[PDB]
């Protein structure tokens, strides 16, 4: 019932590491935290998986402060999730972000967890959103005979449907109609090469396509 | 532009710095879950002097853990039950604008129910906050109490209570990140006491 000591010193070591990190930044730039604390308005909302590999801003060669960030299991945008719907609403309506990106990769454990028949308890309802993506694209995925190619295509279609879910929001549709931003993109990050790849989500075409069923 | 930056970033990472792409795909298990605000200033792993890969991450408006939010409850459940993370941290700072938005009587539409969680923190600590006359100092204390109640919400989860009872991990910590100095400040939450408090019910 007491906290093991190895957990207390693991925790202390973080603070030692933090003090050391501050010293080297102080040596490299004497006003760096002064400039950090200097204002900024993010231009990007980035939605990625909680299974992060590299900070968003560093992949994109931007300052951390130019990217407002959300990470969740399997980089989902479910209809009735007030968590992700609040980040989208705030980013669009308060930050007036010019770009929203959904970025996946082939090693998010969330998507893999969606395909195991196991009871993951509380996780099942969240990962149900990944299985709905399989249903929307069932013929395409059934016709890929290589398991690893099929899995990789599911990861990409999950990014694309998350993007479509962003585009379907009132905030994105109304902002785009009246100000021609934000624009939504779907990307894949390759861990093996460190390269971003555009899925070429057709924003203009997708936004037009959505209007029939989903306008405002 | 972004993709140019990305190619250049891969170069300096494989030219101006060392080649660590094998490590990127090497595979590791995070020892930390970090819950912060979507208004990021510095990557978690860099504040903590760890590899990005040692820290499983969630960011949301005002670093909240609301009871009925399946989004954050799924990251907690996965981190505890699948990743077997040894630490969960909630880290706030004084420039997440969600907390400030929660104190203006404005209708923020869809945001009202999310930010209602911040107003509930004011109510749980109303005497404490009413006694601070300086707006700025009162705001700063609200940011800290918001971290602490987020941490208490983590401790109250089935996943954390059951994991800690049977395996003595994870432990939960609340931190405040000071952007001016870059230093983490421990909020020194009552982990053992909250756990004992939960069993009274």
XYZ file of C-alpha atoms in Angstrom:
417
model
C 0.000 0.000 0.000
C 3.108 2.337 0.239
C 4.815 3.626 -2.985
C 7.931 1.476 -3.687
C 11.120 3.624 -3.223
C 12.379 2.854 -6.774
C 9.274 4.793 -8.025
C 10.120 7.804 -5.723
C 13.762 7.991 -7.010
C 12.628 7.375 -10.673
C 10.409 10.470 -10.089
C 13.267 12.527 -8.417
C 15.642 11.590 -11.347
C 13.118 13.289 -13.739
C 13.527 16.559 -11.771
C 17.381 16.118 -11.841
C 17.097 15.512 -15.634
C 14.881 18.626 -15.936
C 17.395 20.811 -13.983
C 20.221 19.527 -16.228
C 18.097 20.202 -19.383
C 17.466 23.783 -18.199
C 21.187 24.332 -17.586
C 22.266 23.301 -21.122
C 19.544 25.526 -22.701
C 20.748 28.399 -20.452
C 24.313 27.778 -21.728
C 23.232 27.585 -25.428
C 20.784 30.588 -25.337
C 20.648 32.979 -22.288
C 17.156 34.326 -23.187
C 15.664 31.054 -24.641
C 12.970 30.602 -21.919
C 12.387 34.411 -22.261
C 11.687 33.760 -26.026
C 9.705 30.518 -25.203
C 7.473 32.584 -22.804
C 7.112 35.224 -25.634
C 3.647 34.969 -27.314
C 2.645 32.839 -30.359
C -0.657 31.710 -32.007
C -0.601 28.101 -33.338
C -1.287 27.820 -37.131
C -1.745 23.959 -37.028
C -3.965 21.524 -35.121
C -2.248 18.125 -35.220
C -4.203 14.980 -34.225
C -1.964 11.939 -33.771
C -1.830 8.730 -31.764
C -0.779 8.658 -28.050
C 1.905 6.164 -29.314
C 4.123 9.200 -30.312
C 7.686 8.657 -31.741
C 8.757 12.305 -32.462
C 7.135 15.614 -31.477
C 4.756 16.925 -34.220
C 6.551 20.306 -34.498
C 9.994 18.621 -35.059
C 8.720 16.275 -37.880
C 7.213 19.457 -39.489
C 10.332 21.640 -38.754
C 8.198 24.236 -36.871
C 8.492 25.797 -33.373
C 6.511 23.988 -30.614
C 3.880 26.732 -30.219
C 3.039 26.761 -33.972
C 1.260 23.346 -33.447
C -1.799 22.891 -31.103
C -1.845 19.136 -30.440
C -4.265 16.278 -29.610
C -3.168 12.646 -29.228
C -5.582 9.761 -28.512
C -5.690 5.938 -29.042
C -5.628 5.216 -32.866
C -5.857 8.961 -33.775
C -9.754 8.880 -33.827
C -12.296 11.686 -34.184
C -15.508 9.939 -32.952
C -18.872 11.771 -33.447
C -19.849 12.011 -29.749
C -16.372 12.493 -28.179
C -16.548 15.916 -26.437
C -12.758 15.623 -25.748
C -11.671 15.758 -29.454
C -14.755 17.886 -30.463
C -13.688 20.508 -27.815
C -10.073 20.595 -29.207
C -11.460 21.030 -32.787
C -13.962 23.723 -31.670
C -11.275 25.636 -29.670
C -8.581 25.349 -32.422
C -11.037 26.601 -35.135
C -13.153 29.154 -33.158
C -10.546 30.576 -30.656
C -7.058 29.868 -32.172
C -8.339 30.284 -35.833
C -5.826 27.558 -36.927
C -5.283 27.576 -40.770
C -4.537 23.807 -40.999
C -5.810 20.642 -39.273
C -3.784 17.460 -39.855
C -4.543 13.878 -38.854
C -1.230 11.946 -38.869
C -1.060 8.171 -38.359
C 1.712 5.589 -38.564
C 1.982 1.779 -38.903
C 3.068 1.218 -35.228
C 0.153 2.839 -33.262
C -0.830 0.027 -30.853
C -4.450 1.324 -30.800
C -5.226 0.147 -34.365
C -3.614 -3.308 -33.651
C -5.624 -3.554 -30.344
C -8.843 -2.939 -32.456
C -8.218 -6.178 -34.439
C -7.600 -8.602 -31.515
C -10.779 -10.479 -30.492
C -9.750 -9.846 -26.797
C -12.045 -8.028 -24.310
C -10.005 -4.799 -23.600
C -12.931 -3.647 -21.330
C -13.320 0.164 -21.445
C -11.233 0.147 -24.692
C -13.802 -1.812 -26.766
C -16.159 1.143 -27.386
C -13.226 3.433 -28.391
C -11.667 0.823 -30.760
C -15.173 0.087 -32.236
C -14.549 3.264 -34.286
C -11.570 1.526 -36.053
C -13.848 -1.514 -36.898
C -16.477 0.862 -38.365
C -13.667 2.032 -40.751
C -13.128 -1.630 -41.835
C -16.943 -1.873 -42.545
C -16.964 1.341 -44.636
C -14.121 -0.143 -46.866
C -14.752 -3.903 -46.426
C -14.460 -4.974 -50.125
C -11.159 -3.006 -50.607
C -9.591 -4.630 -47.465
C -10.984 -8.179 -48.070
C -9.354 -8.116 -51.581
C -5.808 -7.422 -50.181
C -4.382 -10.930 -49.604
C -1.120 -9.813 -47.849
C -1.989 -9.386 -44.099
C 0.666 -6.667 -43.605
C -0.478 -4.701 -46.726
C -4.157 -5.056 -45.529
C -3.195 -3.737 -41.993
C -1.243 -0.800 -43.555
C -4.217 0.123 -45.780
C -6.548 0.034 -42.685
C -4.156 2.513 -40.894
C -4.394 4.859 -43.961
C -8.259 4.592 -44.274
C -8.494 5.307 -40.477
C -6.542 8.585 -41.047
C -8.821 9.425 -44.042
C -12.085 8.772 -42.048
C -10.691 10.807 -39.054
C -10.101 13.668 -41.589
C -13.671 13.242 -42.952
C -14.963 13.434 -39.316
C -13.085 16.769 -38.858
C -14.496 18.123 -42.192
C -18.079 17.138 -41.086
C -17.887 19.449 -37.977
C -19.952 22.722 -38.008
C -16.778 24.663 -36.927
C -14.709 23.496 -40.009
C -17.626 23.787 -42.555
C -18.604 27.333 -41.327
C -14.987 28.633 -40.959
C -14.115 27.326 -44.487
C -17.329 28.836 -46.053
C -16.757 32.337 -44.541
C -12.852 32.553 -44.398
C -11.544 29.699 -46.702
C -9.669 28.070 -43.711
C -8.937 25.684 -42.159
C -7.934 23.086 -44.754
C -7.733 19.450 -43.588
C -4.894 17.028 -44.475
C -4.269 13.338 -43.802
C -0.635 12.234 -43.445
C 1.304 9.050 -42.583
C 4.652 9.172 -40.704
C 7.112 6.389 -41.646
C 9.197 5.397 -38.562
C 11.725 3.466 -40.753
C 12.688 6.532 -42.874
C 11.379 9.528 -40.823
C 9.485 10.783 -43.907
C 5.965 12.305 -43.920
C 3.690 11.118 -46.773
C 0.581 13.020 -47.923
C -2.493 10.765 -48.364
C -3.803 13.483 -50.742
C -7.199 13.608 -49.030
C -9.031 15.705 -51.614
C -10.180 18.502 -49.288
C -12.309 20.533 -51.836
C -13.840 17.252 -53.275
C -14.379 15.675 -49.749
C -15.925 18.928 -48.430
C -18.292 19.085 -51.493
C -19.021 15.274 -51.205
C -19.937 15.677 -47.449
C -22.345 18.636 -48.079
C -25.113 16.337 -49.422
C -25.665 14.231 -46.207
C -23.846 16.455 -43.633
C -24.160 20.202 -44.609
C -23.861 22.515 -41.503
C 7.080 23.728 -47.202
C 6.267 21.294 -44.316
C 7.484 18.350 -46.453
C 10.674 20.352 -47.391
C 11.256 21.005 -43.616
C 10.569 17.231 -43.011
C 13.203 16.120 -45.631
C 15.731 18.718 -44.279
C 14.857 17.530 -40.675
C 15.592 13.886 -41.726
C 18.978 15.068 -43.214
C 20.243 17.007 -40.118
C 18.979 14.112 -38.010
C 21.034 11.793 -40.339
C 23.809 14.380 -41.059
C 24.100 17.325 -38.526
C 23.161 14.867 -35.723
C 23.487 11.051 -35.349
C 21.426 8.340 -37.108
C 18.742 7.111 -34.601
C 16.087 5.879 -37.103
C 16.885 2.243 -36.093
C 16.010 3.365 -32.480
C 12.809 5.054 -33.780
C 11.627 1.694 -35.218
C 13.547 -0.303 -32.535
C 10.457 -0.482 -30.329
C 10.300 0.442 -26.646
C 7.774 0.500 -23.857
C 6.825 3.890 -22.382
C 7.356 4.105 -18.614
C 5.329 7.354 -18.370
C 1.852 8.509 -19.404
C 1.825 12.303 -19.617
C -1.510 14.201 -19.704
C -0.989 17.853 -20.673
C -2.841 20.685 -22.375
C -3.203 20.898 -26.207
C -1.443 24.338 -25.848
C 2.053 22.645 -25.861
C 5.299 24.734 -25.434
C 8.012 21.974 -25.300
C 7.750 18.228 -25.966
C 7.129 16.243 -22.701
C 10.150 13.922 -23.267
C 12.564 16.935 -23.589
C 11.322 18.660 -20.342
C 11.843 15.212 -18.632
C 15.210 14.513 -20.424
C 13.928 11.149 -21.789
C 13.698 9.582 -25.293
C 10.397 10.277 -27.143
C 9.158 6.664 -26.894
C 9.573 6.550 -23.072
C 6.474 8.883 -22.805
C 2.926 7.816 -23.945
C 1.011 11.073 -24.430
C -2.473 12.645 -24.220
C -3.182 16.378 -24.629
C -6.671 17.970 -24.276
C -8.141 21.437 -23.399
C -7.162 22.365 -19.801
C -5.471 18.928 -19.092
C -8.828 17.431 -17.779
C -9.652 13.826 -16.809
C -13.478 13.983 -16.658
C -15.266 10.873 -15.206
C -17.298 10.045 -18.374
C -14.715 10.984 -21.064
C -13.985 7.694 -22.926
C -11.151 9.473 -24.834
C -8.945 10.061 -21.717
C -10.278 6.923 -19.897
C -9.144 4.828 -22.925
C -5.608 6.348 -22.859
C -5.436 5.635 -19.066
C -6.787 2.058 -19.472
C -4.382 1.306 -22.348
C -1.309 2.884 -20.604
C -2.022 0.919 -17.339
C -3.377 -2.423 -18.694
C -1.411 -2.804 -22.006
C 1.747 -0.614 -21.700
C 1.996 -1.232 -17.831
C 3.325 2.386 -17.405
C 4.901 2.895 -13.889
C 4.110 6.660 -13.754
C 1.153 8.827 -14.838
C 1.682 12.593 -14.744
C -0.751 15.482 -15.232
C 1.274 18.623 -16.142
C -0.363 22.047 -16.388
C 1.075 25.501 -17.056
C -0.134 29.099 -16.589
C -0.695 29.764 -20.366
C -3.272 27.014 -21.241
C -6.192 29.337 -22.260
C -8.888 26.700 -21.494
C -8.771 27.477 -17.727
C -9.074 31.280 -18.471
C -12.010 30.584 -20.921
C -13.754 28.686 -18.023
C -13.814 31.889 -15.843
C -15.491 34.200 -18.431
C -19.321 34.087 -18.258
C -19.335 33.786 -22.149
C -21.322 30.983 -23.905
C -18.555 28.910 -25.679
C -21.285 26.538 -27.065
C -19.956 22.917 -27.336
C -17.033 23.951 -25.007
C -19.326 24.741 -22.004
C -19.710 21.106 -20.847
C -15.888 20.495 -21.184
C -14.930 23.687 -19.277
C -17.695 23.014 -16.645
C -15.101 20.530 -15.244
C -12.803 23.569 -14.460
C -15.720 25.436 -12.699
C -16.336 22.314 -10.547
C -12.671 22.596 -9.388
C -13.418 26.264 -8.356
C -16.461 24.982 -6.318
C -14.447 22.203 -4.589
C -11.913 24.902 -3.404
C -14.167 28.017 -3.283
C -12.994 29.314 0.169
C -9.284 28.864 -0.794
C -9.716 30.768 -4.117
C -12.045 33.510 -2.711
C -9.311 34.351 -0.103
C -6.707 35.239 -2.843
C -7.305 38.921 -3.737
C -4.834 39.155 -6.689
C -6.598 37.985 -9.952
C -3.323 36.626 -11.363
C -2.362 34.704 -8.162
C -5.995 33.346 -7.902
C -5.834 32.178 -11.609
C -2.426 30.500 -10.964
C -3.786 28.634 -7.901
C -6.845 27.492 -10.009
C -4.392 26.059 -12.678
C -2.606 24.104 -9.872
C -5.861 22.830 -8.174
C -7.089 21.812 -11.701
C -3.899 19.661 -12.102
C -4.423 18.161 -8.607
C -8.148 17.299 -9.258
C -7.136 15.796 -12.692
C -4.594 13.643 -10.760
C -7.237 12.642 -8.198
C -9.508 11.617 -11.143
C -6.631 9.404 -12.464
C -6.185 7.818 -8.985
C -9.992 7.128 -8.813
C -9.905 5.036 -12.072
C -10.519 1.247 -11.736
C -7.288 0.649 -13.775
C -4.983 2.671 -11.412
C -6.649 1.440 -8.126
C -6.526 -2.260 -9.220
C -2.979 -2.042 -10.742
C -1.609 -0.274 -7.600
C -3.367 -2.767 -5.182
C -2.067 -5.908 -7.006
C 1.380 -4.669 -8.385
C 2.230 -1.375 -6.469
C 2.338 0.712 -9.745
C 1.561 3.085 -11.300
C 2.057 6.197 -9.126
C 0.422 9.476 -10.133
C 2.131 12.929 -10.012
C 0.879 16.485 -10.659
C 3.402 19.020 -12.076
C 3.329 22.667 -13.162
C 5.673 23.615 -16.027
C 7.064 27.167 -15.730
C 7.660 28.465 -19.291
C 9.833 31.397 -18.083
C 12.385 29.134 -16.299
C 11.674 25.757 -17.996
C 11.577 24.100 -14.530
C 8.984 21.517 -13.431
C 7.422 22.091 -9.991
C 6.022 19.064 -8.081
C 2.489 19.693 -6.670
C 3.238 16.881 -4.157
C -0.289 15.309 -4.349
C -1.676 12.970 -1.633
C -1.474 9.679 -3.620
C -1.666 7.299 -0.625
C -4.402 9.429 1.075
C -6.606 9.666 -2.072
C -6.303 5.901 -2.459
C -7.324 5.430 1.224
C -10.087 8.076 0.814
C -11.568 6.157 -2.198
C -12.094 3.009 -0.074
C -14.259 4.852 2.511
C -17.221 4.846 0.064
